[PDB]
Amino acid sequence: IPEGILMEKNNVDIAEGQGYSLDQEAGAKYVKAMTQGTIILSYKSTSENGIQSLFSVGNSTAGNQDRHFHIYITNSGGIGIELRNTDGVFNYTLDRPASVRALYKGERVFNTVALKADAANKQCRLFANGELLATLDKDAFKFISDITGVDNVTLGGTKRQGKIAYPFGGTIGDIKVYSNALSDEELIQATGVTTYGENIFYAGDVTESNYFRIPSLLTLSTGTVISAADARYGGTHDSKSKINIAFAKSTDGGNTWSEPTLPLKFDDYIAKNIDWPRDSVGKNVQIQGSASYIDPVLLEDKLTKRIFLFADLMPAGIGSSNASVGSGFKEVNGKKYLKLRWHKDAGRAYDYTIREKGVIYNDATNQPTEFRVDGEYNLYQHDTNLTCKQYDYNFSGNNLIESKTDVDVNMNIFYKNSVFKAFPTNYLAMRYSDDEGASWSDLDIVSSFKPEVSKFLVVGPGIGKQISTGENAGRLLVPLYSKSSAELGFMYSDDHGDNWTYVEADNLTGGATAEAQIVEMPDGSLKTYLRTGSNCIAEVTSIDGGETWSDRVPLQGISTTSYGTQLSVINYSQPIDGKPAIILSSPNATNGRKNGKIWIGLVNDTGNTGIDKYSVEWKYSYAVDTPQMGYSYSCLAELPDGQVGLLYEKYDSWSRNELHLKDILKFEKYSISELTGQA
Numbered sequence: 001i002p003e004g005i006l007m008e009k010n011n012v013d014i015a016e017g018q019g020y021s022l023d024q025e026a027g028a029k030y031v032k033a034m035t036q037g038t039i040i041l042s043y044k045s046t047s048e049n050g051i052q053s054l055f056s057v058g059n060s061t062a063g064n065q066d067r068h069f070h071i072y073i074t075n076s077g078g079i080g081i082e083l084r085n086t087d088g089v090f091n092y093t094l095d096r097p098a099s100v101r102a103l104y105k106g107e108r109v110f111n112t113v114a115l116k117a118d119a120a121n122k123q124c125r126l127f128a129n130g131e132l133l134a135t136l137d138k139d140a141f142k143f144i145s146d147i148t149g150v151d152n153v154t155l156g157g158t159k160r161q162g163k164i165a166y167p168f169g170g171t172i173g174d175i176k177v178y179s180n181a182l183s184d185e186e187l188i189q190a191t192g193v194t195t196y197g198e199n200i201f202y203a204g205d206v207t208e209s210n211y212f213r214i215p216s217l218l219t220l221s222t223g224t225v226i227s228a229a230d231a232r233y234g235g236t237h238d239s240k241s242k243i244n245i246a247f248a249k250s251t252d253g254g255n256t257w258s259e260p261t262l263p264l265k266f267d268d269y270i271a272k273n274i275d276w277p278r279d280s281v282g283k284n285v286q287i288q289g290s291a292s293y294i295d296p297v298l299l300e301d302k303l304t305k306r307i308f309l310f311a312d313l314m315p316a317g318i319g320s321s322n323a324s325v326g327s328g329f330k331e332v333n334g335k336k337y338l339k340l341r342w343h344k345d346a347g348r349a350y351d352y353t354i355r356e357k358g359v360i361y362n363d364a365t366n367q368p369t370e371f372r373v374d375g376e377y378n379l380y381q382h383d384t385n386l387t388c389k390q391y392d393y394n395f396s397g398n399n400l401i402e403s404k405t406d407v408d409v410n411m412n413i414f415y416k417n418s419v420f421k422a423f424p425t426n427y428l429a430m431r432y433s434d435d436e437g438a439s440w441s442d443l444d445i446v447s448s449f450k451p452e453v454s455k456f457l458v459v460g461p462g463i464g465k466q467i468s469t470g471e472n473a474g475r476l477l478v479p480l481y482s483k484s485s486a487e488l489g490f491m492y493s494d495d496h497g498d499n500w501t502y503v504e505a506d507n508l509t510g511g512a513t514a515e516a517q518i519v520e521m522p523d524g525s526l527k528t529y530l531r532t533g534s535n536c537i538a539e540v541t542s543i544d545g546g547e548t549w550s551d552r553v554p555l556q557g558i559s560t561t562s563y564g565t566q567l568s569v570i571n572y573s574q575p576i577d578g579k580p581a582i583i584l585s586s587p588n589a590t591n592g593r594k595n596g597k598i599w600i601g602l603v604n605d606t607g608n609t610g611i612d613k614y615s616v617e618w619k620y621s622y623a624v625d626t627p628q629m630g631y632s633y634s635c636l637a638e639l640p641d642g643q644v645g646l647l648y649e650k651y652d653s654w655s656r657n658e659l660h661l662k663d664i665l666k667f668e669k670y671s672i673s674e675l676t677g678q679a
């Protein structure tokens, strides 16, 4: 077996189910006996077949169907390999979901993939579109030379008992088979030749997070486009984990993005890049004692030009599912104050309050203590800043070890080792900025209005809304949802963000996930679209600036799952087909978060008044990729040019099989021409 390229083929069209034989290639004899090596190939799949082998080498004879090696892709964008010589001898597998795509902007596109079988390092590595996807370490290194009775080298399928299995359909742009193991750098470079859309936040950036979720995108009146997202450090798990809120902006219409910042973050647990295990056991493990911020909402007050960032604030070890029932506040002298528990009192004895100027009072004696908190809620004892040891987290097999380090961080009321601990329910936090993110204000916990009977009261991630016309012109609104007297809710402000008022939009006590986004009608009335626990997206209308809302009505014609997925709906500044238009994004499949689509809805005046004044005709739908390709949370934004920007999760964020995937938050842009099927 010579050193270097053993075989190369270009521009091979493969009819679905036919495959293509490489047995007469000069180097087939070498490829059939490879002890290690590298395979790199460019392809365009035109088939919807479940599993599609790109390249294979094996035994095609009767009874030898489990004797082969193949690199394959799935119609859902997964990619992987199977190295087999019957299960009793060996069955090595490696894969990663949502690694490749099929369609981009209405046309089938090429993807570049690579498999590296490194004998010297006893390791197998998969790459695709500039990314290292997965790694397999085996003490008993095996390759093609280890398969019994190899008799074929095939493109577009795997020969099993004389039949073409895992049938590919499309074009193999180029395939190169090397006897040697190329470097990871060479492969990142080689496969990186085909990329689609761009990343704002990514694994390796200054956030020090390997994972991201929950996108927020907003174009400011100044033309600057801003964005935010959960920077999920301990895998992609929801709260009761270590999560911070990342932020970035673009001053060139979304072409390039600034070095990300972390406006909302906690330091009780270190922020670091860690590969979370994806095996059947480890994937379920999450960080237990860390505080976190989760689900961002961005909003601009066009009058003052001030921007706001809201997010749920989870005390140490808390998430929505394990939050305690209560507001977290106590009323004294008619005023609500954040309540605290001295670490040496009874488990549920919150006999202290944070009052004016952060001074902590003893409620029993009604006298101030020697403690106080600053604008960041960090503790001070007699004007000295208190501190505690920061925690680190590492896996020891399938067990996640959370241990204290020697690093001192400021003691915060939301940390597990604080001497004064906040009530274990969730809070609503916010910071404002008058310089587009160069600096942010102190931490403002606006949830003093949280019903004492509620388990959780959280935000509907995405963007907020400011009424532009009518009697309530200027009012700021942020969507909320909860497990309490109401499900859907909202908080609004008439004094440009200084103070907020809570509104219950229904009387549902089930606590279903009613994440919503708000859109304004021509006369200033509002229509809110929301996720529900039923098989449809719901619509509610308000004619009094969000103070009262109509009963839910299903959004007819736009399919979804029972559990649902967050959606994005925005106003568009110019008319489409001569009418006011709103744009909606959401996965369209009835099972699984996949088949994402962008819809354009035209506003019609029915001729009636009040709640029934307007009707929306969802005239256009745009499919982002093929039907099985993953698509979850998203956020649309009208860019300074006519375009519509989209920051979304390109995978299935609900699936227990697609957890902990890096670089799945993508940014794409589309013209109204594209969106309306007008090419």
Ligand SMILES: CC(=O)N[C@H]1[C@H]([C@H](O)[C@H](O)CO)OC(C(=O)O)=C[C@@H]1O
Binding pocket: 214, 238, 239, 294, 295, 312, 319, 320, 321, 458, 513, 653, 654
């Ligand atoms: C605060 C919080 O936990 N938010 C999470 C929310 C929630 O858990 C709910 O009950 C519905 O699943 O769900 C999801 C989700 O991908 O489905 C993402 C959010 O980040």
